[PDB]
């Protein structure tokens, strides 16, 4: 009978940076998916009120408009390889929308960052918030910058649509040999 707290995730006032995405577990609630890119994989969204899952994971972050296509199975790029990677067998939906009004200040919102450098690609659903200085040459950096692995987006309202901030919520639908706790209102 409990409603799933979708608005608590979507309508969160502050979203995390893509390198520090926030994951929340949704369980033991009825999932009304009726409380911009809306891509679903391995599932029909016209049957989302028509399905049951053991758990639903809700990840949230912020990227540019041009990086939204990278949030998908099998993608490649600085966001997909180094900041947020989906599994090739991902089951769930990816939702993004324009956020220039909320996350772009006139001088620039430098609180949002993305990972540019890493020594290995991100394994599915991995997260990395380290500040270790990336060594690009043959000489060890000894902890002194040798590039900082993070770069600020600098969101201003004057940027183009391909550089404006977008708020992304990645719903992951998961099944295991366990009772289903998240169901649409039509199978409550």
């Amino acid at each position, epitope marked *: 009978t409990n409603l799933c707290p979708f608005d608590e995730v979507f309508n969160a006032t502050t979203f*995390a940076s893509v*390198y520090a995405w926030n994951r929340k577990r949704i369980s033991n609630c009825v999932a009304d998916y009726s409380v911009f890119a809306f891509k679903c994989y391995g599932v029909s969204p016209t049957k989302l009120n028509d399905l049951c899952f053991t758990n639903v994971y809700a990840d949230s*972050f912020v990227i540019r408009g041009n990086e939204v296509s990278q949030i998908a199975p099998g993608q490649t790029g600085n966001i997909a390889d180094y900041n947020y990677k989906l599994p090739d067998d991902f089951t769930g939906c990816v939702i993004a929308w324009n956020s220039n009004k909320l996350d772009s200040t006139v001088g620039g919102n430098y609180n949002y960052r993305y990972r540019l450098f890493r020594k290995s690609n991100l394994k599915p659903f991995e997260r990395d918030i380290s500040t270790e200085i990336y060594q690009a040459g043959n000489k060890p950096c000894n902890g002194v910058a040798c590039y900082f692995p993070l770069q600020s987006y600098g969101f201003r309202p004057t940027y183009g649509v391909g550089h404006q901030p977008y708020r992304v919520v990645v719903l992951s639908f998961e099944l295991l040999h366990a009772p289903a706790t998240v169901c649409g209102p039509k199978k409550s």
Partner: antibody, heavy 123, light 110 residues
């Protein structure tokens, strides 16, 4: 079996000194789990210290301990390490080695904790 | 920084139920985990993902999350439930990502 974390290497050290804590792990596949250290100053709450990836390729640190503490692991010998340098009087605490859940992302919650070793920094 | 606000101390009678709150900005947007630290003991996780108890934790321990307050409810309080209880969340905008609350000392009046 069952999970088991046994810390060692604590003691008393003067400020600006150095110390190395070791955590011996058993009851789980040490090579697959992310490891962390969480400390607790006496009569105070819990403060996250640092963490390490299953391979050691990724290390995270708290802002207070950045540039002074370095965390490493040896999956061959099933041991976690916390090398402490330039120790301050604020670093006095009981340091627990903790075990993450299986999978990613690492750092959500910590279901298994060690018994705890005490590090005291005093002039 | 994301700050989790916990009541410093809570006193309950044996057999009754105790409520320990955990406050934060949009705490419903984050998953809250609870830890129990008995005196002289290490922290032990009792609730994860705001509602679920790990194996071995009795059903008397319950979790909840709504709005800006997340509560941990212990029913039928026993003497062994006297401990320090900490709530924990994760934040990506804080530069300190692992957040532990101030903690609550649960005192049972046995």
């Amino acid at each position: 079996d069952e999970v088991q974390l046994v810390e060692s290497g604590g003691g008393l050290v003067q400020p600006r000194g150095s110390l190395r804590l070791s955590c011996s792990a058993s009851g789980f596949t040490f090579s697959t789990y992310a490891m962390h250290w969480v400390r607790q100053a006496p009569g105070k709450g819990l403060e996250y210290v640092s963490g390490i990836s299953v391979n050691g390729d990724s290390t995270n640190y708290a802002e207070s301990v950045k540039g002074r503490f370095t965390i490493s692991r040896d999956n061959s010998k099933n041991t976690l390490f916390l090398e402490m340098r330039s120790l301050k009087v604020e670093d006095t605490a009981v340091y627990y080695c903790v075990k993450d859940k299986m999978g990613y992302p690492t750092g959500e919650y910590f279901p298994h904790w060690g018994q705890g070793t005490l590090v005291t920094v005093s002039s | 920084q994301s700050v989790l606000t916990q009541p410093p101390s809570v006193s309950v009678a044996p057999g009754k139920t105790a409520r320990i709150t955990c406050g934060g900005n949009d705490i419903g947007s984050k998953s809250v985990h609870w830890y129990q630290q008995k005196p002289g003991q290490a922290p032990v996780l009792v609730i994860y993902y705001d509602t679920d108890r790990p194996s071995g934790i009795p059903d008397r321990f319950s979790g909840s999350n709504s709005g800006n307050t997340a509560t941990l409810t212990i029913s039928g309080v026993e003497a062994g439930d006297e401990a320090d209880y900490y709530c924990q969340v994760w934040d990506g905008t804080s530069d300190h990502h692992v957040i532990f609350g101030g903690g609550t000392k649960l005192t049972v009046l046995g």
